[PDB]
Design a protein around this ligand. Structure first.
Ligand code: ADP
Ligand code: ADP
Ligand code: ADP
Lengths: 92, 435, 234, 436, 443, 132, 92
């Protein structure tokens, strides 16, 4: 709504909404349930940054066993993942 | 009026500024050395520096171990978490026992969050939303008995206002920090638009429209663990009928614990939160299986583990889950090396008489000295608890004969009527067919 | 031959006649006003809403304002182009995640690949008959059409049919609106139904609402026969 | 209400005691056991005072000697609006609930909260309804006239009560109770007009009535657990209610009691055949008995120096001595012939059986010879034999025919010992053939 | 023509008006004392006053205990509910055995009802729904009302449907040219089928054709339903049949047994009490039969000691064939018939006695009569002396091989050589045990 | 685009790389031009097991019922596959070797440290080794 | 010494030697907990250093395994044994 903080990727098109700027904090008089106030970013708008992700195998088997496996990551209810998914993950 | 159940005469450990106990202070009679140990453990816990320090207090039955744990909880205060627990509770049918042990560990680490509460409530006098199909903002005017106050609101809140079926003339409840919308009902001024109506009519709020209130929120780490580990998903604010699928408890992975620790660590250094560790108290620790005793070893070495207090009343007893491991107090020798053992001596005649007098005081009963000596000799002859639990039948039998004060004959009548364990065993041995 | 109706409804003691659904359960769970006001609905003297925010929004581990690294990690894991999807997954109930599921696109540079069983499933959607993959993947409908199951009769009917137990609270309308919203939720009840065709023609052509803005309908599973769709037998 | 054919303890309507807590020889369907009845009366006044909590009482004695009769007398003399939970020892070995969680549910089911609230209601006699509608039904106006045996009125209604009246259709001649706040329409019935059937209400039309509410701790624990609604009180899938929700309930009941909007009533939890519990249950029980919100626990057992379940040793009454230290024991005794005769006469008057006096003496003799329950069971069979030969009074040979037909314990043990070759022993050996 | 399996030649106890049993009548041979006791308990359950009365049938194997229970079931008739059960059925993986015990306890109490049904029925003539002013407001349905025109014999009614009624109208897929059945108690809707007022053979959906229904569109009919308390309990536990969201979502979920609380049972009992006080229902106590009660263990017996003291429990019949057998689930105590003495004290034991040679002979004779078989007198005497020699059941089950071997020789009668062939072909328990003892490698 | 003949069934595989840089941002991927002509017949060979066919026919396919997408979100709990499903898969497979399309390649199931099994699985293994 | 430096506990040489002798006789972890208890006893006396009297007070207050085993075996009638027998009353 013209004043929310977003970040867009160019190579992948990653889209997020970080929240609302503090310049519009005294605007709506009751912010509501699904918003959060963040500082407006400074500096150069276009930033390059290389980050490295280390992923275990069990994360991949628990993601690819279901439709949404990250809830199975954080709730532990994997429920005895099969073996063909394991050998396909090993092959890939 | 007031209720007592084998306790509530315990107010504290009865220590002075130098850490020395009086004889009769804080509802405690005798038991000096264990009270010094408990006071030192209370000071160590209040130091707020340590993780995984353990304490086991042992002794004979009816000696005051649970009384000492409750005195620790009263001396510590209600702000610090205190988690009472029976060792039999860890055997659950939904999850494993080590999982329940970890949740009872993390239930003993609390937090203190500084929050505020601002509330708008009163008479709705204007509902004017404006666009630019999609609304831009809604201006709502609120009215109370001390004046009116108009507000600007966002369309997300307007969706909840539309959900609550709010029209002109209703009394609403707006919490600006959360975004909660609550409808109370129509006003008393609109009560005469119809003779019979299906709506409820409330008067105007007598206070101001805007109220401010400072609050302090206490949550444990286990609440933050269970808030992020819902398997079905989140729930709405008003849920009178539950979900169609039953959510059972699941074992929570260590990764979620790492993220919750990261979030709490990111919130502590900004001054928003204050970390308060607490006490996990386990009574009857001899009931535990050997695998829980082994996972207790790894759980005590964590960086966020609380101070654990255990109790037992056993001797050279085989630990459960084994066949030939004779160990003291039902604790294995691996775990007992990391423990610190506080003994609990039994009592003599005069402290038992003092305990009887103190508990007769707290139950608002008046006893003669002659009946008091009889009850003391009964307590030393049979059991302390048997002299404890005959006070209220003595009061009933005294009140039956229009007397406010206990005499010897009521004690003899309650002796004849109610039996202890040894007289029942004597009747059991000299019997024909199953008593 | 019908199940016994364990219900109380408005019956007549005998240019149109309007019939309204009024079935209620004879068992009534009577609840006081004090519990519902002081423990469910927020007010000035309790902290239901503050604790709900503090547990669901501020300390939520999928919040992009505080755990952006975790959101990026899970985005690389799943390949989903929105970082706010984990927040929306974690904070709505199950059936709301069911009935508006959309088959959105996921980027190729990810780790959630196509499982061989899922590829075997996805091959045979629009494949016609006498194809080897379709015939190997259509055992159950072959057994349906060979065993003549679409013309079989119904032998079992339930004995008692009862509505859910009505909770009553005397002297409050908010509980009545909440109960009516929970029992007759229009989103779920529209998911368990369909729109009439002339109504659809009034949506699309005469009102200009496009097809993809429709509420989701027709999620009820079809019965085995026309005889198995009901409990009343002629 | 409360349908019941005839029960084993249905003749007991309470403890027969005077105002000085003294037992009558025969009062309210109970005879014998004077000191046990006095002790149970002491327990009754202990609960009725309600100023103390968490006290466990063990009732031990020989089998078929007034234990469950004593508990049913206590429950009957307690009356309504006091929680009374009667469980068995085998009701806690669940597959979806744990044993300690089930004990916590049974403990919290016996503590109630008394809430007094008022709700204004309109109840009267419907004389005439007028409904005016448009073509599209957008605007509706209506008149409702309604009455009591005292007054008369006419009411102008809004469109929502119009919709709520065409729903659950109210005709003329009907008696309707109307709730203004929630819009609930209840049809009490039709009035007295020949032209079901109830009477026309009297007094004021707009009555303000108060009600006295009772709610257990377990109901609030189920409701305040947001994972399941109030349907778990009926379906039974509460499913391991956590501890922080119990902490909130325990704080809020004290917060309600200090403001005076609620009062706490204590009840009695009865655990019948307590010797079938496990040791892990007793270990939970010793620490559960010292809570503020704990009821008075009545436990009954009949075993004598038996092996405690889950252990390998023997204990008196099947309970370890740490539990027995926290208990005060009431002991019952056997019955004489006069008390057995009085019990049999009471059970004869209860089941509408007419006896001859010599048949009653024969029943008393075979009751003091074999069992009380065998004599109390033959008295219903002999009445059926009496009606099989078309006479009302049960005579001596009518009881004798039932004694010949229906067997007791020791006689059956004697023929088992005599003809054990035709039965399956512990080793699984039987003989079927009659020859060789 | 007909099918039989080890029973159904027993038709009843077969007594006089005074209860004196005959020698051979009604498929029964002997057992006069046991049959008279069974007549007494049959009159007792027909008296409909007693609750929590229990007997135990004691006897050996192959002596007629389960036959007595089936004779009680046929003497009571089909109207009084009879619940056959086995002691191994109490062990469930879904739910504890305590709840299974009161599950079968509440399954054995019958009830009638006289229920009024408000019925709208006819042929639908028009289907015109009307739309809302704003349908995409998020709250509220797409439509507001549906006009239905019902035509029946001597009458035509036009009704304005609720949307909630229209959901259950649409789910059974109605159209113009159909016959329906609105049942107004629950909102349940039956699509009767296509009317015969239109064409018949021009369809392709194997439909059946119904004439126009008689009477007016609006009806009030009386329906007599037989029901138990258990069906009311499981209907209130898992509520299906309404027109809410939860009613649909319960019909699609997996059914599973649950631990029914006592509170719903008390409320259901109060509702049944208010039904029986208005002169509509009438209560039918029944008979619960547990065969092989010795396979029950100690906690089920301890709970049954409570279950018999309820004011709603029916007459329960038990049966066992053990002399001196320890209870299952205990270690050292020995009690008669595998039943602990605290439950034995509440029983009324009925002895069952073994038979003689002539009783075995006439039982085999009546059995060969029932399976439509013809036996020679010498072959019948050989069967009788075999039934005394080895067992009654071995001779009872050997006669169908005599029928087959007589049929395969183009013969009608059964001869002694045929019986000797059936002797040599099939073995018994004693010969198999003798072969097992004199065996080389556990043969 | 991708088009198969006898099914129709248009599916969108992506956008061409020549239409990549007209907007500064874009979310969709860019598969380049496919090699070869617009029309070719390719003979593929696919390797599956009988257990894959059993677990594919056992679960419901892509359906519109709420049960199908509700269980697709839930935990994949294993369940007792009946003999009837296996018999139907075996007869349709045997019909397809009879058509000459599919070839059956039996393999090796290898279990080590067989002392850990108890007598129940041994008895079922005795039963199952006599199968066809 | 390393553990007490990590726990920020300042001792004497005599108290360190006494705790070293205690960890020679008993196990190491008994002294490793005794330093933390004796530190709290040390600030109970408004003293910042750990002396021998605080170690002696913590040693008499808090028991190891061996002293508890000895005191249990001296008073075995007051404890519940392996057969569930305990002399509850103090007078015979
Ligand atoms: N020093 C004491 N002063 C006063 N009361 C005491 C003292 N020691 C024990 N008691 C009382 O004796 C009872 C012993 O019960 P409890 O402590 O539960 O036994 P245990 O120590 O075996 O757990 C307690 O209820 C407590 O009130
Ligand atoms: N004092 C009494 N008055 C009347 N009936 C009694 C009395 N004592 C025992 N009975 C009868 O004896 C039978 C056994 O009593 P109960 O207490 O249920 O068994 P138990 O003693 O084994 O618990 C009951 O049916 C009851 O009717
Ligand atoms: N009185 C009888 N008359 C005829 N057949 C009988 C009689 N008693 C037993 N039988 C036969 O003996 C068989 C065993 O009877 P049943 O009661 O079912 O088992 P059991 O006697 O071993 O408990 C039955 O198949 C029945 O046909």
């Amino acid at each position: 709504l013209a004043g929310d903080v977003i970040s867009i990727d160019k190579a992948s098109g990653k889209i997020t909404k970080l929240g609302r700027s503090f310049a519009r904090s005294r605007d709506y008089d009751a912010m509501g349930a699904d918003t959060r106030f963040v500082q407006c970013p400074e500096g150069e708008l276009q930033k390059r940054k290389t980050v490295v992700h280390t992923v275990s195998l069990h994360e991949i088997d628990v993601i690819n066993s279901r439709t949404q496996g990250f809830l199975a990551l954080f709730t532990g209810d994997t429920g005895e993942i099969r073996s063909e998914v394991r050998d396909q993950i090993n092959t890939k | 009026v007031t209720r007592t159940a084998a306790h509530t005469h315990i107010k504290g450990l009865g220590l002075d500024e130098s850490g020395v106990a009086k004889r009769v202070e804080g509802g405690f009679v005798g038991q000096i050395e264990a009270r010094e140990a408990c006071g030192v453990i209370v000071d160590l816990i209040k130091a707020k520096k340590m993780s995984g320090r353990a304490i086991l207090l042992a002794g004979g039955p009816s000696t005051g171990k649970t009384a000492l744990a409750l005195a620790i909880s009263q001396e510590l205060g209600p702000k610090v978490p205190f988690c009472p627990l029976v060792g039999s509770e860890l055997y659950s049918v939904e999850v494993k026992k080590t999982e329940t042990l970890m949740e009872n560990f993390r239930r003993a680490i609390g937090l203190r969050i500084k929050e505020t509460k601002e509330v708008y409530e009163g008479e709705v006098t204007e509902l004017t939303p404006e666009d630019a199909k999609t609304i831009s903002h809604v201006i709502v005017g609120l009215k109370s008995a001390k004046g009116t106050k108009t507000l600007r609101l966002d369309p997300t809140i307007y969706e909840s206002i539309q959900r609550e079926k709010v029209s002109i003339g209703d009394v609403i409840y707006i919490e600006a920090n959360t975004g909660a919308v609550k409808r109370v009902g129509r006003s008393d001024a609109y009560a005469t638009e119809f003779d019979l109506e299906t709506e409820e009519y409330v008067p105007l709020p007598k206070g101001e429209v805007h109220k401010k209130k400072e609050i302090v929120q206490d949550v444990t780490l286990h609440d933050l663990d269970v808030a992020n580990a819902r398997p079905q998903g989140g729930q709405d604010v008003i849920s009178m009928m539950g979900q169609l699928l039953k959510p059972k408890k699941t074992e929570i992975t260590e990764k979620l614990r790492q993220e919750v620790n990261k979030v709490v660590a990111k919130y502590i250094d900004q001054g928003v939160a204050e970390l308060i560790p607490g006490v996990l108290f386990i009574d009857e620790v001899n009931m535990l299986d050997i695998e829980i005793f082994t996972y207790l070893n790894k759980a005590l070495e964590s960086n966020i583990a609380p101070v654990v207090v255990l109790a037992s009343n056993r001797g050279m007893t085989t630990v459960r889950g084994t066949e030939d491991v004779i160990s003291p107090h039902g604790v294995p020798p691996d775990l007992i090396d990391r423990l610190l053992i506080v003994r609990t001596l039994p009592y003599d005649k005069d402290e038992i008489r003092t305990i009887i007098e103190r508990r007769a005081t707290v139950e608002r009963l008046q006893v003669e000295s002659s009946a008091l000596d009889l009850l003391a000799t009964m307590g030393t002859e049979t059991s302390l608890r048997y002299a404890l639990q005959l006070l209220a039948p003595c009061g009933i039998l005294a009140q039956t004969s229009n007397r406010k004060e206990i005499v010897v004959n009521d004690v003899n009548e309650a002796k004849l009527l109610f039996l202890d364990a040894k007289r029942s065993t004597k009747i059991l041995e000299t019997s024909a067919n199953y008593l | 031959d019908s199940p016994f109706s364990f219900t109380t409804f408005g019956k007549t003691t005998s240019k149109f006649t309007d019939l309204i659904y009024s079935s209620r359960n004879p068992i009534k769970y009577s609840l006081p006003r004090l519990i519902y006001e002081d423990l469910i609905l927020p007010n000035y003297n309790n902290d239901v809403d503050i604790a709900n925010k503090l547990k669901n929004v501020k300390f939520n581990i999928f919040n992009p304002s505080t755990n952006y690294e975790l959101c990026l990690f899970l985005s690389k894991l799943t390949g989903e182009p929105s970082l706010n999807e984990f927040f929306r997954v974690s904070t709505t109930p199950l059936l709301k995640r069911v009935i508006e599921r959309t088959n959105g696109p996921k980027n190729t540079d990810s780790l959630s690949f196509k499982t061989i069983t899922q590829e075997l499933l996805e091959v045979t959607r629009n494949a016609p008959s006498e194809g080897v993959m379709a015939s190997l993947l259509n055992v159950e409908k072959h057994a349906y059409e060979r065993e003549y199951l679409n013309c079989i009769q119904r032998g079992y009917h339930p004995n008692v049919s009862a509505p859910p137990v009505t909770i009553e609270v005397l002297g409050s309308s908010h509980v009545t609106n909440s109960i009516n919203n929970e029992l007759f939720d229009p989103l779920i009840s529209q998911a368990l139904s369909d729109i009439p065709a002339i109504t659809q023609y009034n949506m699309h052509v005469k009102k200009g609402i496009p097809v993809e803005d429709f509420p989701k309908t027709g999620l009820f599973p079809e019965p085995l026969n026309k005889n198995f769709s009901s409990n009343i037998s002629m | 209400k409360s349908l019941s054919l005839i029960a084993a303890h249905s003749h007991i309507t309470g403890l027969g005691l005077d105002e000085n807590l003294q037992p009558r020889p025969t009062s309210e369907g109970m005879v014998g056991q004077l000191q046990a009845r006095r002790a149970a009366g002491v327990i009754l006044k202990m609960v009725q005072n309600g100023t103390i909590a968490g006290r466990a009482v063990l009732v031990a004695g020989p089998p078929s000697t007034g234990k469950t009769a004593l508990a049913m007398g206590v429950s009957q003399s307690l009356g309504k609006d006091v929680p009374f939970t009667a469980i068995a020892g085998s009701e806690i070995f669940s597959l979806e609930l744990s044993k300690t969680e089930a004990l916590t549910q049974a403990f919290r089911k016996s503590i109630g909260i008394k809430i007094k609230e008022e709700t204004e209601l309109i109840e009267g006699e419907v004389v005439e309804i007028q409904i005016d509608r448009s073509i599209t039904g957008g605007h509706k106006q209506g008149k409702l006239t309604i009455k009591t045996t005292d007054m008369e009125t006419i009411y102008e209604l809004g469109n929502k009560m119009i919709d709520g009246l065409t729903k659950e259709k109210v005709l003329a001649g009907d008696v309707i109770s109307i709730d203004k706040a929630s819009g609930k329409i209840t049809k009490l019935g039709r009035s007295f007009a020949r032209s079901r059937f109830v009477q026309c209400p009297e007094g004021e039309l707009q009555k303000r009535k108060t009600v006295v509410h009772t709610v257990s701790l377990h109901e609030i624990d189920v409701i305040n657990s947001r994972t399941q609604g109030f349907l778990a009180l009926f379906t039974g899938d509460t499913g391991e209610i956590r501890s922080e929700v119990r902490d909130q309930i325990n704080t809020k009941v004290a917060e309600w009691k200090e403001e005076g909007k609620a009062e706490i009533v204590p009840g009695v939890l009865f655990i019948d055949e307590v010797h079938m519990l496990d040791i892990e249950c007793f270990s939970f029980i010793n620490r559960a008995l010292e809570d503020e919100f704990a009821p008075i626990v009545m436990m009954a057992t009949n075993r004598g120096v038996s092996k405690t379940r889950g252990t390998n040793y023997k204990s008196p009454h099947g309970l370890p001595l740490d539990l027995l230290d926290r208990s005060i024991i009431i002991t019952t005794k056997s019955y004489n012939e006069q008390e057995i005769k009085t019990i049999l006469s009471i059970r004869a008057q209860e089941e509408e059986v007419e006896l001859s006096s010599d048949a009653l003496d024969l029943l008393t003799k075979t009751g003091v010879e074999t069992s009380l329950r065998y004599s109390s069971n033959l008295i219903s069979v002999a009445q059926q034999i009496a009606m099989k030969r078309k006479n009302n009074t049960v005579e001596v040979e009518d009881v004798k025919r039932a004694y010949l037909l229906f067997l007791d314990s020791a006689r059956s043990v004697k023929y088992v010992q005599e003809n054990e070759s035709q039965y399956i022993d512990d080793q699984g050996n039987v003989q079927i053939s009659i020859a060789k």
